[PDB]
Amino acid sequence: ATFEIVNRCSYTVWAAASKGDAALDAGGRQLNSGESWTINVEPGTKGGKIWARTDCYFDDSGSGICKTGDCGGLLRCKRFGRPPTTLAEFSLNQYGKDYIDISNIKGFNVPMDFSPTTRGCRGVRCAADIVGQCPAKLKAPGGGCNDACTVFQTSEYCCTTGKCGPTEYSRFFKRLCPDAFSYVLDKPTTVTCPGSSNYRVTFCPTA
């Protein structure tokens, strides 16, 4: 499947793509403002994620750091990124269908649209100014808006027991972005697409 990753932000982002224990495609790349990077994700990829990283520095070997979404200091992510990270999440060719969502469960750094480029389902978007409106206690000094699990490490926020409800913090994410997961047990905003659909992830879609 192809995922065109497009940075519409006015700032550079370093896109990342991983399924947690492996890179997807090259795993990461710099996207200057307006750049598009098209990756190929193997059919059947389960639990893949794409995200933006901000304020990154990499040496010639592709080692360094980002202020948001850093994936073990690598340009080419092999693992998931350090919160806060708005997440485009997908599982492909799962009994004939693809499943996509956006999640704020690991916080929010960059606004995102995640849409199919092929027929048969709708896209999802979280493009509200979550960083600007972020509750004081969730603001990440490094940049972005942390989820409450990250900040407070409670069973309730992290849904450790598989028993948790919405919280003042989750409700903030949900209010700003109704169409993204705000906590682990949120009413799902997952979209079912045809198996083998193709997609575009757009950072800062609202230009």
From Swiss-Prot:
Keywords: Cytoplasmic vesicle, Disulfide bond, Signal, Taste-modifying protein
Any one annotated GO CC term: cytoplasmic vesicle
Disulfide bonds: C9-C204, C56-C66, C71-C77, C121-C193, C126-C177, C134-C145, C149-C158, C159-C164
CDD domains: TLP-P
UniProt cross-references to Pfam families, sorted A to Z: Thaumatin (PF00314)
Stated family: Belongs to the thaumatin family.
Reported function: Taste-modifying protein; intensely sweet-tasting. It is 100000 times sweeter than sucrose on a molar basis.
Protein name per UniProt: Thaumatin I
